[PDB]
Point group: C3
Chain length 374, copies 3
């Protein structure tokens, strides 16, 4: 007969036994503070200090670092071992030999492929001498005995698969590219000339033809960087503040003040809220195996061994997390005893050890995923 479930983040309330509601649309890039002494109607001398602090919206993007994009010049030469044999990016016809090669290479920016986008606000609530701070994801709720804070919002600026380009120390801003070349890179494309890491170019294709007249090449001669700069107003910029780059992840606060989200704060002073996720179930967790990759839009799968006690069944979520960042979650009805739960995730880096987690509790160790693009 019991069907415990903690996937509901929120409360049951009696609207007559609720004392305060704050409901408002808040500038995404703004913090908010509320302070009030909660006093009895007139029939006491007891007051409770309420102090709520909501921080500015933060974006967290799991990415794959693509390395640097380059500008360069396409040069044509004739040989009748070719002179341009040392050039990393080249193309030749063997009739008299005609040759193309890239030179005057210069990095113009750092590119990042978006894997996951998540927005959040840090929310701190003091009620009496209770003090609790939590990072609340957009469309999730802060839940406590006396205070509920729900954030509801939508943003459509960034999409998975977008490529972000930063031209300089671009704590400041960047460009969004929706068509960065991937499976086919031709000279002239956004992303045409890349260096994924320190050394080594991924060279673009040269789709045109040679003619042996003095060699000629009848394909495009203009680099992707120059073609993009020539129509730069066609592309979308974004701005950033307090950037935080870590391996395969970027966090910042978008200073775009045109964006808003919705905040609802409900307070009960005397009788506790009914926490809709309340349960007596107890969970133990360890990792079993992993497969798949970090830094990948295809992702990984973490297998967890999950022990349930004190309940016959428990509907809940098991997460793949590391250092308080979660990369995936699986909703599951656990049965008493041992359970095997597979969690699909995306993101992380080579040093990530993905742990099996429930709520704020995690396994003692995690597992590494494989590298992408091998």
């Amino acid at each position: 007969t019991p069907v415990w479930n903690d996937n509901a983040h929120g409360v049951g309330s009696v609207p007559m036994h609720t004392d305060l509601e704050l409901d408002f649309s808040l500038t995404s890039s703004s913090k908010y503070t509320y302070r009030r002494k909660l006093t009895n109607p007139l029939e006491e001398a007891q007051s409770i200090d309420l102090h709520i602090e909501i921080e500015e919206q933060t974006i967290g993007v799991d990415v794959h670092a693509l390395g640097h994009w380059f500008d360069g010049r396409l040069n044509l030469k004739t040989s009748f071992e070719y002179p341009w044999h040392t050039a990393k990016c080249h193309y030749e016809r063997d009739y008299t030999a005609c040759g193309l090669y890239l030179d005057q290479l210069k990095p113009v920016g750092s590119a990042y492929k978006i894997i996951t986008i998540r927005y959040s606000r840090r929310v701190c609530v003091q009620f009496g001498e209770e003090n609790l701070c939590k990072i609340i994801d957009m469309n999730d709720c802060f839940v406590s005995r006396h205070v509920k804070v729900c954030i509801i919002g939508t943003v459509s600026k960034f999409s998975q698969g977008d490529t972000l380009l930063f031209f300089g120390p671009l704590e400041g801003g960047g460009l969004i590219f929706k068509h960065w070349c991937t499976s086919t890179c031709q000279f002239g494309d956004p992303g045409d000339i890349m260096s994924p890491r320190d050394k080594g170019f991924l060279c673009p294709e040269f789709p045109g033809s040679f003619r042996k007249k003095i060699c000629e090449y009848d394909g495009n001669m203009v680099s992707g960087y120059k073609k993009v700069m020539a129509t730069i107003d066609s592309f979308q910029s974004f701005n950033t503040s307090t950037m935080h780059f870590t391996d395969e992840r970027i966090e910042w606060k978008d200073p775009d003040g045109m964006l808003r989200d919705h905040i609802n704060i409900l307070v009960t002073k005397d009788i506790d809220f009914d926490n809709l996720g309340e349960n007596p179930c107890k969970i133990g967790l360890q990792t079993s195996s992993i497969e798949g990759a970090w830094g990948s839009g295809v992702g990984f799968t973490l297998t967890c061994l999950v022990s349930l006690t004190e309940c016959p069944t428990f509907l809940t979520s098991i997460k793949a997390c590391d250092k308080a960042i979660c990369y995936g979650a699986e909703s599951v009805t656990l049965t008493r005893g041992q359970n095997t739960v597979k969690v699909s995730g995306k993101g992380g880096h080579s040093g990530s050890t993905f742990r099996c987690c429930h709520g704020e509790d995690c396994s003692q160790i995690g597992l590494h995923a494989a590298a992408p693009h091998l």
Copy 2:
């Protein structure tokens, strides 16, 4: 003076005459159950059984089935009726004849073009001996005399125009392509070699040049499938559960437990809610004509003859539906007597008979739309 309107799905309430509110963020891939005996404060012995069941979020995607994508090898031959004349996909130069043809063809997956995306949850509410189940679309509300259930959410995983690729019996997962070739398919593109149905290839272009030295071809020689596999981590996977393929439609439950939506449940025990859509207007419906296409991003238009009685005017919505799936809706202020209402829709298949509908009531017959891509 009267201005009846049923486009508002919700209730007017007096916050003092409301007995229970549930407000929470729910894992999209999780169900939720609430059971409670509603009892009088202390001054009676009468109790009402409240039982709410909210099912896991379902996605319904109206699609155009594109057929199978193929891998293949590009072969080059010389003829001085060509040997490769039986090859379906070929390219030749007539000087000595040089020829390209695709062979070693193999289907690698099934592709589907997204036309419409809609999310929903089935919601069942028992209040006393009243029992009602409804499929509630995201950002719509369940309305009854004593209980309101509103679902508010946003998802940004899929977009109209995306192409979904399933590699095997991919009850399991698939890939999202945002640049599947349409108006120009060149060999090497995602989607380059397609077979729309049983037999018959839509062949890709071969943009390169021949040279008569022994023939040479200086264009790309690598299939789209191989180019995509070589950078597979650049593409976004998704997972599925309890898939349901029907003609030009796919439904499933996304097991991504990182996604949440918002649920609000309001209960009044004694006095009924004010149903904001309440009205005495009566509607009769029949189809008149149709034009446009199923399986098409451009869509169709259903013309309806709509009779209004018992009201001078009625602001409402007329829908194009078949078998309890709706494909389009037009908001309209009807006038007493006959009205002509055009409803723009998208989706459906060759067997669809699009009916004119109001609320849960539909015309006796529907009309077929035309096929796309003729």
Copy 3:
């Protein structure tokens, strides 16, 4: 100790001291009207007229007008000053001279690049003899002493960077293109042949090769318009109603009745709401400088000189606006005295004079931004 903040648009309420709540999901393309006499329980003879009018959802899109897209025929000629020298779009090989040129040109539609998308509803509230109308952006709130109206919604039909094509006097509808050519336009692409203004073509590239046999060209010979028409069902249409084109901006009401948003209306009859943005701070504004461009996805930056009095600090937003349309906003904690605030914006046209604004108050003059695509 004081920390005034007006970035919160909403109210604090005591759920016992609230008299009416309307909560509902409303068809986006529908208006809504609520009329009620607010009367005392039984212990008075005083009534307040409540009258709420919510208008249909409007979309406002800041765009860059791209001019007209053309259909045309690619012709091949041989010359052994070339005949086709007057043709604006041409390509030649100088061996006998082979030539390509476009002719039979015809405009097929007008194209617009999406820079910004915003949805809104005009909301009018009469409470007693108080009457106030405001345009409320989606995910913002109408706030008054006795009535709060919040709109919460999400739409995923249009995206920044999409190109909208209108084929005729397309008050009626249009097509969405997600891959309109920008940095590389080749003959055959959507957007291949453009005329940005009255005269002057931006000609596409012809990536193929000539051969001197009688000249031959082995590249694509089919215009982008014809290639798109041949697979028109692959593209997404949209419909429009009551269109309003102005320079670099389009407004309309989307008649898609499948879309909904959420409306919440809270009314207190006696005691005023606590306006969460209430403050004694006073602001004076003038422009200082501007840089950047209108009609550009990169945008502009307006520098404002902002004087704060009556408060030590004030957390607020400074906006860049002209004629009651706002193009950007910066959240900022002002300090008493003079402040310099930079506001990033996008949109507008050559005649726009971007002003520094706070709430409904603006500077006496604004500044012009520079033209894009120079």
